[PDB]
Automatic annotation (TrEMBL), chain A:
Protein localization: Cytoplasm
Source organism: Paenibacillus sp. A11-2
Protein name according to UniProt: Dibenzothiophene monooxygenase
Keywords noted in UniProt: Flavoprotein, FMN, Monooxygenase, Nucleotide-binding, Oxidoreductase
Record-listed E.C. numbers: 1.14.14.21
Keyword Nucleotide-binding set for record: yes
TrEMBL record, chain D:
EC number, UniProt record: 1.14.14.21
Annotated GO CC locations: cytoplasm
Keywords: Flavoprotein, FMN, Monooxygenase, Nucleotide-binding, Oxidoreductase
PANTHER family: ACYL-COA DEHYDROGENASE, ISOVALERYL-COA DEHYDROGENASE, MITOCHONDRIAL-RELATED
Enzyme class of the recorded protein, top EC level: oxidoreductase
Ligand binding (FMN): 80, 113, 115-116, 147, 266, 352-353, 400
Designated name of the protein: Dibenzothiophene monooxygenase
Assigned protein family: Belongs to the DszC flavin monooxygenase family.
Localization, UniProt: Cytoplasm
Biochemical pathway: Sulfur metabolism; dibenzothiophene degradation
GO molecular function, one term: flavin adenine dinucleotide binding
UniProt domain Acyl-CoA dehydrogenase C-terminal: residue ranges: 242-375
Gene Ontology biological process terms in this record: L-leucine catabolic process
């Protein structure tokens, strides 16, 4: 059954037509987000009984990469939707799934999030203060709120305060984006990933109801520290990022090759008759396509392990740690590959590819160079080294 | 996992003695006999013919496992399966019905006499002269005859000469290594792969009987030029090499880390208290370990595709060509990785890992540096680039 | 050291405004006039003819300093000296006695209309003038140019078609149309669009040598073939200058804006071991590349002053220049992209930081001619003792 | 004239003829050390008065690189002689120089050293200097990595004071005869590469060191380095010696590969190549590496000239010394990466028979480079350059920075 991927391929073909002009303007890709809504693919992981497509993580990852190859901002928004959905699905009650998932199919929910902040260090000042009847009031500003614009629901994270049952506990809630007191600020103006709407969101006395809470306050800390099933969220999400990088890489390589076939001039001073026969043009394409073939094959194999563990009732700390090691290794390789490829392929195309800004090939490097900084690859490398040398699995967190 | 556990236990024994054995060079007779007794030489022979009925994924994992311990034994074992692949793809069912039970019962370890030391690799001078009964007489000298010592049979290639039906056609045969006129010269003295017995073999009036011939004269050339199933021999064999390189990489990385945990000193000049906590030491293991995880995951996917096509009655040129591209890609990546890693890991261990020659860690680089030159990775890179850029599959041959 | 101080002060003023100017593209007229007022366009004109009587080492260092502040102004400045070098190597002493004092008095900033089977023809007229027709591409510095160095191929010529002629002409000569069609990834203010020649008359006292003389000089490896190594080392210094500017600009950001990765236990970004390793690797390569380029620049000056140059001397210089360009190309391309990893996501999240200018400028200009063939040329020399075949690119 | 460099070039020619067979055996290259003695080059930095050659550091560095290109062990022994000489010259008294330097010319001294130890880390020194009467010291303990300790006319030796009323833990250095009673050169050097540098252990049992053999007072070196006084030049001088070893090895390896490619490599006729020397990828490998080598070598010449300029100054500021160390460290980083990559990757330009035939011996270049580049970790040289560039902090002077 290749139907969902055919749908994703068609969406990607449509986005390529206009990505050049859209990403320059920046702002919100409303018409494209609506196309994704009409496609149904946002419901890939909702069971058919709940109205969804009942598909699997390997299908999701393939779709992410295909869309990302055409438009990295739409690939990112799509992918982050599934990170948000993964978190919801790992913590939602049976009651929450029974009503939210049919509603997500019917209202075509495209999820956004508000998690990170811009404080002195990456570790939170957005507060959740208890109310009567079990409610909480959210106050503060979040940064890098990907897909916060035109989101139907926001996955929001806060830390308890003035809480008789414990301060500093992490609350997560799934709330309407138009809930009173929620202000999406629209201040995203980035080198690349220009249509991800990853600006700031301000919360002024925003009410969260108990039926919107994803677990009890602090449950995510307990689930991660114990390697409970929700600790799969991080390898899942980091593998989503990996697939954005491989998709950008593939898109840049294909776009460059089409330029070389149709536009490059041979370096006829050295007796080359066509650029596509030049030994150094061929070596550049061979070196990068070969690394891409291995990385994609490896990413498929890790995607299948995500699915296998996703279906288990219990995942051991060793199973989760090994997956996280495999995922981090994939992200490392994909980061280096995409950053190098999107810059060096100009050398296979020639000066005219840069002399006309409107050709727009630099979008691939700008998108990859922006996103690959999401968290430092130097510390993903350290985690894999600490694992290999010292037999220490990474400590489960939002980042590892 | 039975077969793989046997391979692991063999490797563990080989590790104890490889340092002393490979200095001397020469034939690792005791270790070859232990491989004979293991049964693993029969991995791909069907259970009906007395073999293990196993698959290429298992063979590839066993090759890498043995090579991680002793690269020469891994090579001999791996090349045995390249020789077996050729016999299987070209021999008649009647031949295999006789040979394969005999190979089980007599514990056959196959060697080959194929390449030559002439002006270029596309220039064979070992000749097959047709005799009236359908026999041939082989004359000339072969080079790089891996596993030619202590071999139960040699896979021999020659070109027809004095042939009224056409000179220059390639014939292949499977013959006893002690047949009259066969002289294994024992002149292998190399930088690495020191116990592969890849010396020269001289044929003086060597008779080949019709029931020892593999196909008809020039049939292998016809199969290559057609991209038909017997041309799978090359991607199969090139993926064997790939697994040697991944196995050496993994062995070198594990041996380095044992030294780093046990013997490396902290660089207290800079405030480090434990070498295993040094950030640059950790970054070296992390970078190489990550690349190895991705390469090993991708290699497993290509190994499954080898098994799929291996089981088909007919293979198209597009199936074979796509597989060869995937193999070539894995070989490029594995080559770069093992060459870099076996040299750079010294930087994670310190000067005394090199100042004490008897630690012997340079064996990994010597073995990898020798074997990776088998055929030029620059032209594997070209082949992948010519495919990606120009949609041309590699021209099938003994190398591509 | 005065010339270099003047260049340093020019560069300081250029850094204030480059971020806003380069976005707009077009012609940096005010900055070109500041260069005119500095006197530095006359660095290589002898004091006898009213210039500064300075050396190629000073010129190269000045180019790299200006480039580190504004790569387009560094390129325009550098190319001026490529154009000047061509004039000096092919002009008659009588031509120089007129042109160079005029260049000083009128503060000439030279431009180029050479690159484009040449579509720009020179048809001989009976007096020895030539009529030029066609459109040139990549005419760097073609706007606001006091003179253009122009190349064309003879056509309808009893004395031989396909011979290269070169001339130095006014940019407002009748029939010259500078098109302003330059909208590029980087080098955005170099005015490297096209120039259209419609029946443009070039007079005999404007011609540089005789038709085909530049080809014969290349084939001879004689002194005028120095033009290529000279110009390729100009490019090298553009790349070194961009490298240095990017590194210093990144470091400023790291000191002022980078957050530490507290989840690793890091207290300060400037103490992060991996941040420090990025700056160390790139700063170390940059030091060596800069030191090596100073030595090649001294050799340019040595041969520049000779009456005669052998093909061996020229070929050895070209190999040294090619080597420096190769190292400088790899360095600037890798550095301008990887330094983001030392600064953090917010350096890319805020487009207005504008750090991507360094990569865009370097990524654009390094494509001028393919570094893969500079590598082949050095390898063919080392392995086969064959010098590069002289051309406009080697 | 180029007389001294001509002498070095002729020495290196002769060493090349026999290095392949000599380094296999390891042990002491006595005959070659004697040829260096007869050459007079060990006196390069002794004034023409005192009988030396009155030459400069740039000449020294060029000779080191030239000899190293032919025989890395002899290049190392030669370069380390000048590191030892530099330390002596920076700390010796005027009467010590008046006696030692003519004696070094007369007796053709080839210096070695016994400095490092094999304890828990490189700061953990346990070879002790215990006071004797009349200002002498007794040395006890074992040193490791004692380069040139065999066949040495004098050993430069380092110890830490113990049971010393004038203060314990102070570093003393002395220049002593290698056959003084109680010095035992152990002959246990058996290395991957640098196999003829005699960098094994030396054991000191009751060895007497006299006051006129002490190089400054105990602890003077700590003050001179910490303060950036003139002796703090010893480290950039010596690290630049290491840099020229790597560039010498790189050049010798590149030239040996090119000889093999021209005469033994086969064309990959499968792809239509008729001559390996016209193969586009063979040419790219030689071009990449020759290009980086030219730039590294040109750069090294500039830094060598700066060494000479500061060597001649009466006082060097911390900023001048720190700039020099950063330039030296930069040169060493680039040269380290270059030699390690080149000596491995050039096999790809040569072909499989270059590895298949052990006796070709090309792996010597990698073995020598891979061994010596580990002397001190390049990762911390990189960190030191980065700390300077980002934080404007010069390296803290030490025996390594
Ligand atoms: C080939 C070689 C020669 C050396 N020669 C000396 C020497 O002459 N004097 C000295 O103090 N250290 C010498 N060293 C050692 C370094 O100063 C340092 O002690 C050593 O490289 C650190 O070892 P480790 O990284 O295993 O901990 C030498 C090291 C090598 C590899
Ligand atoms: C920024 C830039 C400036 C250039 N300036 C000049 C110039 O002033 N004069 C000239 O003859 N060529 C100039 N070129 C010409 C390059 O040689 C040419 O664009 C390149 O070789 C074409 O590569 P392609 O045909 O594969 O696209 C310039 C190129 C670039 C990228
Ligand atoms: C393109 C982009 C999208 C991001 N999206 C999210 C997001 O959806 N949710 C989130 O919590 N953080 C998001 N982040 C934040 C990063 O995880 C992290 O906060 C940031 O890289 C820190 O910046 P620094 O390295 O300068 O300190 C995003 C970052 C980037 C660059
Ligand atoms: C360690 C090693 C083992 C080899 N074993 C075989 C072999 O068993 N059969 C064969 O036909 N060629 C073998 N080869 C040789 C390659 O097929 C090929 O002939 C090689 O490229 C030598 O050529 P070169 O020196 O020109 O690069 C081997 C090569 C090496 C380095
Ligand atoms: C190259 C050519 C022919 C061969 N037969 C077995 C191996 C092998 C390698
Ligand atoms: C550390 C201490 C003293 C030394 N003398 C020569 C090298 C060296 C290293």
């Amino acid at each position: 059954d290749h139907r969902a991927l055919d749908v994703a391929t068609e969406l990607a073909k449509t986005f390529r037509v206009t990505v050049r002009e859209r990403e320059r303007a920046g702002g919100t890709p409303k018409a494209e987000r609506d196309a994704i809504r009409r496609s149904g693919l946002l419901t890939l992981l909702i069971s058919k009984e709940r109205g969804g497509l009942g598909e699997s993580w390997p299908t999701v990852y393939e779709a992410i990469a295909e869309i990302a190859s055409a438009d990295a901002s739409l690939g990112h928004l799509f992918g982050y939707h599934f990170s948000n959905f993964a978190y919801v699905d790992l913590f939602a009650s049976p009651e929450q799934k029974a009503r939210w998932y049919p509603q997500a199919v019917r209202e075509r929910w495209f999820l956004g999030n508000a998690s990170s902040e811009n404080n002195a260090h990456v570790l939170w000042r957005v507060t959740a203060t208890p109310l009567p009847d079990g409610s909480y009031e959210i106050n503060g500003t979040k940064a890098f709120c990907s897909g916060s614009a035109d989101a139907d629901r926001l996955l929001v994270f806060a830390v308890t305060s003035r809480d008789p049952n414990g301060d500093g506990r992490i609350v997560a809630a799934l709330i309407p984006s138009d809930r009173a007191g929620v202000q999406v600020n629209g201040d995203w103006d980035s080198l690349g990933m220009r249509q991800t709407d990853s600006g700031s969101v301000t919360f002024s006395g925003v009410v969260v109801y108990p039926d919107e809470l994803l677990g009890t306050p602090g449950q995510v800390t307990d689930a991660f520290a114990s390697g409970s099933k929700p600790s799969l969220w991080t390898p899942i999400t980091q593998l989503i990022f990996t697939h954005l990088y491989l998709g950008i890489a593939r898109g840049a390589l294909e776009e460059a090759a089409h330029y070389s076939r149709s536009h490059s001039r041979p370096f006829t001073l050295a007796g080359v008759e066509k650029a596509t026969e030049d030994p150094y043009v061929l070596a550049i394409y061979g070196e990068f396509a070969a690394q891409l073939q291995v990385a994609e094959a490896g990413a498929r194999e890790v995607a299948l392990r995500v699915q296998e563990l996703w279906e288990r009732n219990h995942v051991t700390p060793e199973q989760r740690g090994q997956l996280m090691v495999q995922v981090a290794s994939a992200k490392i390789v994909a980061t280096r590959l995409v950053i190098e490829l999107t810059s060096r392929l100009y050398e296979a195309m020639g000066a005219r590819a840069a002399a006309s800004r409107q050709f727009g090939f630099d979008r691939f490097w700008r998108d990859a160079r922006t996103h690959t900084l999401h968290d430092p690859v130097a510390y993903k490398i350290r985690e894999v080294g600490n694992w290999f040398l010292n037999h220490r699995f990474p400590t489960p967190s939002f980042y590892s």
